[PDB]
Ligand binder design. Structure first.
Ligand SMILES: CCC1=C(C)/C(=C/C2=NC(=C\c3[nH]c(/C=C4\NC(=O)[C@H](C)[C@H]4CC)c(C)c3CCC(=O)O)/C(CCC(=O)O)=C2C)NC1=O
Ligand SMILES: CCC1=C(C)/C(=C/C2=NC(=C\c3[nH]c(/C=C4\NC(=O)[C@H](C)[C@H]4CC)c(C)c3CCC(=O)O)/C(CCC(=O)O)=C2C)NC1=O
Ligand SMILES: CCC1=C(C)/C(=C/C2=NC(=C\c3[nH]c(/C=C4\NC(=O)[C@H](C)[C@H]4CC)c(C)c3CCC(=O)O)/C(CCC(=O)O)=C2C)NC1=O
Ligand SMILES: CCC1=C(C)/C(=C/C2=NC(=C\c3[nH]c(/C=C4\NC(=O)[C@H](C)[C@H]4CC)c(C)c3CCC(=O)O)/C(CCC(=O)O)=C2C)NC1=O
Ligand SMILES: CCC1=C(C)/C(=C/C2=NC(=C\c3[nH]c(/C=C4\NC(=O)[C@H](C)[C@H]4CC)c(C)c3CCC(=O)O)/C(CCC(=O)O)=C2C)NC1=O
Ligand SMILES: CCC1=C(C)/C(=C/C2=NC(=C\c3[nH]c(/C=C4\NC(=O)[C@H](C)[C@H]4CC)c(C)c3CCC(=O)O)/C(CCC(=O)O)=C2C)NC1=O
Ligand SMILES: CCC1=C(C)/C(=C/C2=NC(=C\c3[nH]c(/C=C4\NC(=O)[C@H](C)[C@H]4CC)c(C)c3CCC(=O)O)/C(CCC(=O)O)=C2C)NC1=O
Ligand SMILES: CCC1=C(C)/C(=C/C2=NC(=C\c3[nH]c(/C=C4\NC(=O)[C@H](C)[C@H]4CC)c(C)c3CCC(=O)O)/C(CCC(=O)O)=C2C)NC1=O
Ligand SMILES: CCC1=C(C)/C(=C/C2=NC(=C\c3[nH]c(/C=C4\NC(=O)[C@H](C)[C@H]4CC)c(C)c3CCC(=O)O)/C(CCC(=O)O)=C2C)NC1=O
Lengths: 160, 58, 158, 162, 160, 162, 160, 160, 162, 158, 160
């Protein structure tokens, strides 16, 4: 989390937390209620967010589910929607942690090699995540949507 | 993150003998970070070495 | 390293599930104790040299034999290393206090420390006594907020 | 004939750095003064001079003294440390960082455009730490400096090794 | 400063600033007004902070201004107060920067060698800085007092 | 590098002065724009690859000879190097905009850049054209104030190159 | 080429070429006329190879030239066929060199970054290379088809 | 020791002792009788040397033993005189070995940070060590006094 | 580096000749001065910190603007760099006095130092004045003959930087 | 590593006492024997190549099966390594003879050597026999001065 | 040189010369007259030493000056005696320098490659150096004979 990153910077220099790192930890603890609120909203509506995101993605990119497409068939399309749900859960982890470290540690490190071996079109994943970002921003206030959009955009940029 | 203890013997069978001490470079145990574990593994193999033991402290 | 939030995240991720109300409850409790834990850590940091000096004084008064010729704390170098290790313990207990988790202590301090001390000849109960004295001083200055982390260090050494 | 530094017209070496023919090797059982001198040589060679007191690494020095890590690992960590960043990275472009890393980690200069391209690409895409990791895991480093010798400026032609 | 530290950390990793670093900068620029008011407040309380800190130091360390002490005489006492003067200016710099980078770069790195070369006892540094802490934080409200105390504690720890 | 705040700090430290009304006003001016700069940096970071795709497409459409055989960007490697350099220009413009200062463009980018490009034979006018296209693409994302701000650092780079 | 690899290997060991290295060079120079005739055969049939390979590619991946595809439009289809022609010329260069070094240096290093910047899907590149290999090997004898297929397989593996 | 340094230099180059190194070892073995004489004189007179040096140190710097002094009280004065005795023993070791390796290993490496964390005034220690040097020179002949003063001055310069 | 003995050996070896009477006279001269040189070197090493303290005090008293804001020695870091430079000058002058030869000052100190000082903005005349201050203090501590010996190497450094 | 003087200094330091009459007696006895040990070490250095040659000849006359195909000393490189190890033992025995203390042998030669030979497959008893033959040659050339250090090496391997 | 090695050892650790190094330099300069008389003695009898040593070498190794030998002929024998004179002069240099550094830097580094390129047998050089040693130590007293013999022994070991 943000606390972990501040502690790591303090450890690398063999010193206690600095005034800047203390401001960081304090401002993270002050964001606790807002981050928890956004995380509850994204977690409780996860199923419908994924449903809408998958619908939008498959509309934009029919060849994904078209015969010969990567997501053709029930199992492969379900696997796709499982991946979208994974990325949404990682986005909630990032919202609570206050950094992108859990998102990297669980899903982003090695995702490009994975998707290249499986011939998963990364731009289509980017459309799916963009759709999920829009669905979630619908269910959040402007500040809350901005808070979640940071991690959605981080996932998108790490893909592309 | 995590650190791995490697114990290995890397011989000198491909090069001429020298009068300097190389017993350290030959048989050793070291702590390396996980991100360096594959390079260390492959360089031990490429130099004809044998990985005697691998441990993960914890 | 892990803080409390990352530990909860890893629990949920190993289960594969989104956060539930229970997990959100532990997260809110950590956020609630955060400001007081920050104040305690800042207090420790402001008095680190004084705490270290007082705890070294206590350890060597209680075990004067360590400083006598032939003791493990006898030389300027070995004494400096002893107080250096005490400073390690204090700073990493403060990190663990801020993070709300003992993981930093395990990975950065305790991992292989017993083996290192036996190889060097450092006496384990003497070091544990030093950690206990440090715990007492820190408790006197900030209360009982950090004594779990000192207890963790003492158990890991033992 | 006697006592001439390598380099001819350029046989000079700034006194902040080590003498050009000195070799600093880590052994497992050596005196504490030898250990401190070895650490001082590592700083003198990676960072080109001794830092003001209070700037040296704490935990890494303890690991090196104990033998938990090696000289190569210490050099790797120093060359990517905040000291190296504040000393060289913040004041130079990455092209200059390529010659700095060659001088510090391999004791020489890049000889051709491919040697520059490799570490410049690493710096451009992955940063200083990746470039340092790549440079100290080269076979050239492993064969010239090994695992327990401080890197040094090399002055004898050795085409097989760069 | 905060922004420079973020940019340098991102630069050495060949990346754009992540959401966490942008959060750090956002919290820093949101607090610029109160930081700047605090720095102003410490700036008007110039002569009083320096004078009272010097009085407390000389009372708690009378050896410094006794004959043979380092601060003995009018000129040496003036140089003594001038060093406290420097350090208070550095503490204001660090307050506006949001980090202790100005303090570290202007008055901490090499300070051991400077004061060894000048024969100035470091525990006198520490006591004079703690006296400056007490006087300065006596002049601020709750949160600002702690915020300025952290800078003074960094500096007193560095002088030790 | 220097940001705006450390620029003011350095000026007053060199004069040996506390902050006065002018210094506090400069700092207020920087803090006021900080939310805009952070928003622009986040927008640019979110769309960087898109910006580079569009800017490189415009530059190679306006100068097709760059990517045809005989051009400086004709191979996969030199194409990759060219859009990598565009990534430099975008990322360092964003750093400088977020700092409110062109210093990092001086230490990290411009120093030695003309010499590097002249030695490689990289056409400097074409690189400036790519920088201009990148400026236009970025302005068509970040918004009027942030576009006008990013433009300052893009023109700083262009002037430094030409 | 073969000679370049032999000399580079000998130089990395700082020695003259061993009998085995000279054996590699003798084998390479003996087969020179066969390679030259294969390369002439492929260069004479440039346009017909590229036309048929493009036809099979767009037949087996119609989504590339379908609306929304990367190669939709006459200009983008022409750019696609142009890339196929580039790689065919590279394969002829590699055939005369006896090794894939010209292919690697001119059209493999940085190819993935290039096509990612161009939104070009790598599996489509792999399928295009397989189609071009089919057309090119169909024009050659049983013996020659094997070695030219080796160059095409290297190219397909590199684009994968 | 001198022999240790010669052997370590020979072993660093994987060679036998050179004529210069053999000459160094022979010179040390010749000076052994004078070395044992100086060490014996300093060893039998340790009590009076330390007592006189402590007396004149405490007279030069009475604030050390005054209330609030670093050596105030019986225990702290005892530890101060014990440190002076330690340094005299180290000087005898150095006189015997012919180098400063025992002095560095046992007493000097780490003394600076030790006395820094203890806030022991290094100038007071140097006053005591110089005082011990004059006490020793009083009991030694001129050449013996010079030989002892070499290692005394090494200790002083390592402290300073 | 060279000492007086190595200088003689170099002359006679490049000429291809055995030692003649004049060479033996030169070698006798160096052997005769050896005791004085060793005494002076021990005195300097015993007193190096005090020499630096007195010399920097005199330099910063004569030129108080060096260590005030705007001066090149105003910050703890730049003051530390200053006194460290003076310490290295003293140590290498002591080396060259032992060797009886100024070659080590050419190989380890002077070459490129004027350029570094100009590039950093270090005042060179002030550095020469500091070297002169060290000369005065050292001459006070070593005695008349050793002072005349050390003055040669101090003036060599001064003229090299001047 | 230690020499005899440093060993005595460490012994006194572990007790925190000054040198007494007996310690000065070991020290003066070390100084008295110094010139003979230097003469022996110079003799060994001047004749190192021969000593090594007939030591290898003695070893491989006693145990020709080391040189036969499939033996540990069968290849030009492995024979090189064998003679190189014998040169190690000779040089470090000479260092120990000059120092008068066997520590340099312990840290520089014997530390990790037995495990390294077992990993390499180098036969310990044959190496001990080679050390013994080298001891015989050296003793024939200089006398019994260097016998103790060769016996130390043999015990370390054995 | 002794002085140069002491200075370089001090420089490698960035320190002033220790008491041990100064003692080494004192020991060297105190012997200057003796080693300088030895250099004069060897220099004055150079014709005698070269002629007797050549006679001893050619009696001990008749194959060198018989047909098929490297020194066969008067011109090649004169070259042989000439570089005997080279090594005698280097020995005198090393005697005045107190170390084998002049010998190593003028006549040892790269000597084996030189004598292989010249087809000079190294065992013949070893025998020649031993003959020069015997003749030259015959002209000196025992104590001087030993110290000169060390230089010749280093030379013979270096040529082998
Ligand atoms: C929580 C961390 C985590 C992540 C991120 C993750 C991604 C992931 N997705 C996979 C498969 C897959 N992923 C997808 C999704 C694709 N389908 C369409 O093309 C879309 C463009 C796109 C998603 C929007 C599909 C279809 C598969 C099956 C591929 C196959 O059958 O070969 C696989 C291979 C293992 C498997 O068979 O499931 C991984 C590792 N796995 C993890 O454990
Ligand atoms: C100075 C301290 C030191 C010691 C002692 C030392 C011993 C040593 N001997 C080695 C090889 C060897 N050592 C031997 C020794 C011989 N085997 C024969 O049977 C004989 C019985 C015997 C000697 C009398 C052999 C045959 C090898 C080659 C092993 C192989 O690579 O197969 C190696 C492996 C590295 C290399 O080949 O250079 C070490 C480390 N190294 C050191 O740094
Ligand atoms: C933060 C991670 C970390 C830890 C925990 C750590 C402990 C540590 N302590 C060490 C030495 C030491 N540690 C001690 C401390 C003991 N002596 C006793 O008298 C006391 C009761 C006790 C201390 C309370 C001493 C005396 C030494 C020196 C041992 C020697 O010189 O032989 C060493 C060996 C390397 C060195 O000399 O610096 C390590 C690795 N190092 C690390 O990098
Ligand atoms: C942040 C500061 C910085 C910059 C900018 C920088 C640029 C830089 N570009 C390089 C190569 C290159 N740069 C380019 C880019 C050009 N191609 C032209 O067509 C275009 C007009 C133009 C880009 C828009 C190309 C094609 C090369 C390859 C040159 C060659 O291999 O001959 C190189 C040589 C090493 C390598 O190939 O990676 C450097 C150092 N380095 C730095 O440290
Ligand atoms: C000799 C080394 C080399 C290569 C290979 C190379 C390729 C290359 N392909 C390009 C565009 C393109 N390349 C393709 C080809 C792909 N799209 C389809 O999906 C197919 C699967 C596939 C071809 C088989 C297409 C369609 C474009 C146009 C993309 C666009 O501009 O929107 C461009 C941009 C400039 C232009 O369009 O003229 C280059 C430079 N350049 C080089 O210097
Ligand atoms: C054998 C190598 C060795 C040395 C050199 C050494 C010095 C040393 N002196 C110490 C305490 C001390 N040292 C002194 C000496 C000071 N009093 C005056 O101010 C003077 C300026 C100065 C002496 C001339 C005093 C007063 C203390 C007690 C300080 C305290 O406990 O707070 C300590 C801390 C541990 C202890 O209390 O014993 C060490 C390590 N210890 C060693 O094992
Ligand atoms: C911003 C970084 C910076 C600092 C801090 C700094 C301090 C500084 N203090 C000095 C003298 C001094 N400094 C002091 C202060 C000490 N005396 C007492 O012991 C007190 C404990 C303590 C003050 C609280 C004194 C008394 C002197 C006069 C010493 C003399 O006369 O030589 C000097 C020598 C030249 C001068 O007078 O200016 C410097 C450079 N310079 C810098 O560039
Ligand atoms: C052993 C041979 C040798 C020398 C001498 C040497 C000098 C040297 N002095 C430097 C900086 C410096 N040197 C000085 C000293 C000057 N400023 C004051 O005004 C004085 C008048 C004057 C000294 C009396 C200062 C202040 C700096 C810091 C410059 C800066 O930080 O910008 C630097 C730049 C790197 C660094 O800061 O560590 C070098 C290389 N280097 C060598 O290898
Ligand atoms: C100062 C350091 C130095 C040395 C030592 C040296 C030796 C040397 N000896 C040479 C020729 C020679 N040297 C010898 C000596 C050999 N003949 C017998 O075999 C003996 C075993 C042995 C001498 C004892 C002979 C016979 C030649 C003539 C062979 C030829 O012309 O190739 C040559 C070739 C050029 C010339 O004749 O001047 C050199 C360079 N050169 C140097 O610069």
């Amino acid at each position: 989390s943000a606390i972990t990153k501040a502690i790591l910077n303090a450890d690398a220099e063999a010193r206690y937390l600095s005034p800047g790192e203390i401001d960081v930890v304090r401002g993270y603890l002050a964001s606790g209620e807002r981050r928890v609120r956004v995380a509850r909203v994204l977690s409780d509506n996860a199923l419908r967010i994924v449903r809408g995101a998958g619908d939008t993605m498959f509309q934009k990119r029919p060849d994904l589910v078209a015969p010969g497409g990567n997501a053709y068939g029930e199992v492969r399309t379900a696997k796709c929607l499982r991946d979208l749900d994974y990325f949404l859960r990682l986005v909630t982890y990032g919202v609570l942690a206050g950094d992108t470290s859990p998102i990297d540690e669980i899903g982003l490190i090695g995702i490009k090699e994975t998707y290249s071996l499986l011939e998963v079109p990364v731009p289509g994943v980017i459309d799916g995540i963009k759709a999920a970002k829009q669905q979630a921003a619908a269910l959040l206030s402007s500040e809350d949507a901005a808070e979640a959009s940071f991690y959605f955009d981080y996932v998108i940029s790490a893909m592309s | 993150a995590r650190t791995i203890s490697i114990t290995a013997c890397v011989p000198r069978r491909t090069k001429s003998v020298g009068a300097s001490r190389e017993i350290q470079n030959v048989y050793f145990t070291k702590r390396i970070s996980f991100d360096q574990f594959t390079p260390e593994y492959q360089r031990i193999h490429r130099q004809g070495g044998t990985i005697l033991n691998v441990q993960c402290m914890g | 390293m892990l803080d409390a939030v990352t530990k909860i995240i890893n629990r949920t991720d190993a289960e594969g599930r989104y956060f539930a109300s229970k997990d959100f409850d532990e997260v809110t409790r950590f956020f609630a104790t955060g400001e007081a834990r920050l104040r305690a850590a800042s207090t420790i940091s402001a008095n680190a040299a004084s705490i270290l000096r007082e705890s070294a004084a206590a350890l060597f008064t209680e075990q004067p034999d360590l400083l006598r010729p032939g003791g493990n704390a006898y030389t300027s170098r070995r004494y400096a290393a002893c107080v250096r290790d005490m400073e390690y313990f204090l700073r990493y207990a403060t990190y663990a206090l801020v993070a709300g988790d003992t993981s930093v202590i395990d990975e950065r301090v305790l991992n292989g420390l017993k083996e290192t001390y036996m190889s060097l000849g450092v006496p384990i109960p003497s070091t544990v006594a030093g950690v206990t004295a440090m715990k007492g001083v820190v408790a006197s200055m900030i209360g009982s907020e950090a004594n779990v982390y000192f207890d963790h260090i003492a158990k890991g050494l033992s | 004939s006697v006592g001439d530094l390598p380099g001819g017209l350029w046989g000079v070496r700034p006194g902040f750095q080590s003498p050009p023919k000195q070799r600093y090797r880590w052994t497992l059982k050596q005196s504490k003064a030898e250990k401190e001198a070895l650490l001082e040589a590592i700083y003198r060679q990676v960072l080109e001079r001794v830092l003001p007191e209070g700037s040296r690494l704490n935990e890494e020095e303890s690991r090196l003294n104990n033998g938990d890590i090696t000289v190569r690992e210490f050099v790797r960590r120093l060359a990517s440390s905040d000291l190296y960043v504040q000393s060289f990275l913040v004041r130079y472009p990455n092209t200059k960082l390529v010659e700095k890393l060659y001088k510090h980690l391999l004791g020489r200069a890049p000889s051709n455009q491919k040697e520059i391209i490799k570490y410049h690409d690493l710096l451009a895409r992955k940063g200083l730490k990746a470039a340092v990791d790549a440079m100290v895991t080269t076979e050239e480093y492993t064969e010239i400096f090994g695992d327990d010798t401080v890197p040094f400026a090399r002055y004898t032609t050795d085409p097989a090794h760069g | 400063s905060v922004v420079t530290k973020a940019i340098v950390s991102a630069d050495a990793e060949a990346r754009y600033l992540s959401p966490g670093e942008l959060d750090r900068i956002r919290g820093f620029v949101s607090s610029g007004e109160r930081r700047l008011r605090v720095a102003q407040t410490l700036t008007e309380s110039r002569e009083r902070i320096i004078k009272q800190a010097g009085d407390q130091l000389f009372q708690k360390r009378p050896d410094l201004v006794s004959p043979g002490g380092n601060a003995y005489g009018a000129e040496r006492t003036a140089s003594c107060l001038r060093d406290l003067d420097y350090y208070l200016r550095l503490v204001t710099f660090g307050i506006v920067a949001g980090d202790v980078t100005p303090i570290e770069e202007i008055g901490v790195i090499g300070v051991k060698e400077m004061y060894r070369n000048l024969e100035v006892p470091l525990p006198g540094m520490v006591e004079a800085v703690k006296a400056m802490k007490s006087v300065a934080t006596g002049l601020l409200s709750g949160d600002d007092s702690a915020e300025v105390g952290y800078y003074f504690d960094y500096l007193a720890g560095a002088l030790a | 590098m220097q940001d705006a705040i450390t620029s003011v700090i350095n000026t007053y430290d060199v004069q040996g002065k506390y902050f006065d009304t002018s210094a506090f006003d400069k700092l207020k001016a920087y803090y006021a724009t900080g939310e805009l700069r952070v928003r622009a940096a986040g927008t640019i970071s979110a769309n960087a690859a898109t910006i580079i795709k569009e800017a490189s497409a415009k530059l190679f459409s306006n100068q097709p000879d760059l990517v045809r055989p005989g051009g400086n960007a004709y191979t996969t490697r030199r194409y990759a190097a060219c859009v990598r350099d565009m990534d430099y220009f975008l990322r360092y413009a964003t750093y400088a905009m977020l700092a409110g200062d062109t210093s990092i463009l001086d230490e990290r980018v411009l120093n030695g850049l003309k010499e590097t490009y002249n030695s490689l034979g990289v056409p400097i006018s074409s690189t400036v054209q790519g920088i201009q296209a990148m400026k236009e693409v970025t302005g068509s994302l970040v918004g009027s104030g942030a576009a006008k701000e990013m433009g300052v650092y893009f023109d700083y780079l262009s002037s430094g190159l030409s």
